[PDB]
Design a protein around this ligand. Structure first.
Ligand SMILES: *[C@@H]1O[C@H](CO)[C@@H](O)[C@H](O)[C@H]1NC(C)=O
Ligand SMILES: *[C@@H]1O[C@H](CO)[C@@H](O)[C@H](O)[C@H]1NC(C)=O
Ligand SMILES: *[C@@H]1O[C@H](CO)[C@@H](O)[C@H](O)[C@H]1NC(C)=O
Ligand SMILES: *[C@@H]1O[C@H](CO)[C@@H](O)[C@H](O)[C@H]1NC(C)=O
Lengths: 36, 100, 51, 41, 50
């Protein structure tokens, strides 16, 4: 039988922007702007 | 220490201090936002190429004793048990031992 | 290909019934939006103020 | 490296930016037995 | 454009041959329904054979 190759997914709704895309959901992100 | 004290007859100087602050602020804001956007596109492309690279690493070792399925999976033309599956993950699949 | 005019990426389709150029709607549209956003990031993120 | 708290600071501070959000992806695109990377995580 | 080529290559699988110039040729008669399915991403691979 088969062996599939893939990657991690989770329940994150954290979104980031890129040059080509907007509102892209990522599994993990780091905020590098200190707001508090 | 940001912020300087100027008298009311120094407005033409206070304004230069303001300009450096606004000037550097636009430089850093523009660069910070493009740095983040450029890095995020590179990051996502990196991750997508890493999983494809893994697929090819596997494809290259499995060679002709498998078929690709077209959905990012492979199927063997021979019985493949835990030792076989572990070898594929390990990069030790003994291709010459198996046949269709 | 000079002939395809209905998008950036596409197909030739040369079967026995004839040859025509078709944009791959999904590929063209995604690339199109990607480029548009790129141009806008360069332009729209520039800050202006009265000076 | 960056902060948006206030433009006037005293001390050894991050750079001030006119931005509400600088977020780096660190993870994978969270794309939401039958498939591999082709269809999603 | 390369990604499109591979999307197509992956669905066409073994009922085609690559030509080496960025084109594919079928080992079976391929009419408008067939060609449209390849463009659509619905090529019914199991229905065709060499
Ligand atoms: C997502 O949420 C469900 C509960 O609705 C939980 O059982 C599951 O483990 C969570 N999955 C991940 C990847 O966080
Ligand atoms: C991005 O997300 C914001 C909410 O944080 C929303 O207002 C905006 O319309 C979204 N942009 C796009 C292109 O979806
Ligand atoms: C690969 O196989 C060898 C031989 O059985 C074993 O010693 C080694 O630990 C395996 N490596 C991995 C990553 O499983
Ligand atoms: C794909 O095929 C289905 C079934 O004939 C049709 O309804 C759909 O519109 C086609 N999509 C495209 C992009 O041609």
């Amino acid at each position: 039988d088969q062996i599939c190759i893939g990657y991690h997914a989770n329940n994150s709704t954290e979104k980031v922007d890129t040059i080509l895309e907007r509102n892209v959901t990522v599994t993990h992100a780091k905020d590098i702007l200190e707001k508090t | 220490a940001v912020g300087k004290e100027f008298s009311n007859l120094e407005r033409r100087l206070e304004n230069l201090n303001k300009k450096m602050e606004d000037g550097f602020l636009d430089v850093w804001t523009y660069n910070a936002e493009l740095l983040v956007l450029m890095e995020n596109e590179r990051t996502l492309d990196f991750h997508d190429s890493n999983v494809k690279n893994l697929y090819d690493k596997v494809r290259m070792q499995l060679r002709d004793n498998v078929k690709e399925l077209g959905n990012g999976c492979f199927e063997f033309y021979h019985k493949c048990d835990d030792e076989c599956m572990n070898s594929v993950k390990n990069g030790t699949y003994d291709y010459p031992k198996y046949e269709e | 290909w000079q002939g395809m005019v209905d998008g950036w990426y596409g197909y030739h389709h040369s079967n026995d019934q004839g040859s025509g150029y078709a944009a791959d709607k999904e590929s063209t549209q995604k690339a199109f939006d990607g480029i548009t956003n790129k141009v806008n990031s360069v332009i729209e993120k520039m800050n202006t103020q009265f000076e | 490296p960056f902060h948006n708290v206030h433009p006037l600071t005293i001390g050894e501070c991050p750079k001030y930016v006119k931005s509400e959000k600088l977020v780096l992806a660190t993870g994978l695109r969270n794309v939401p037995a039958i498939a591999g990377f082709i269809e999603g995580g």
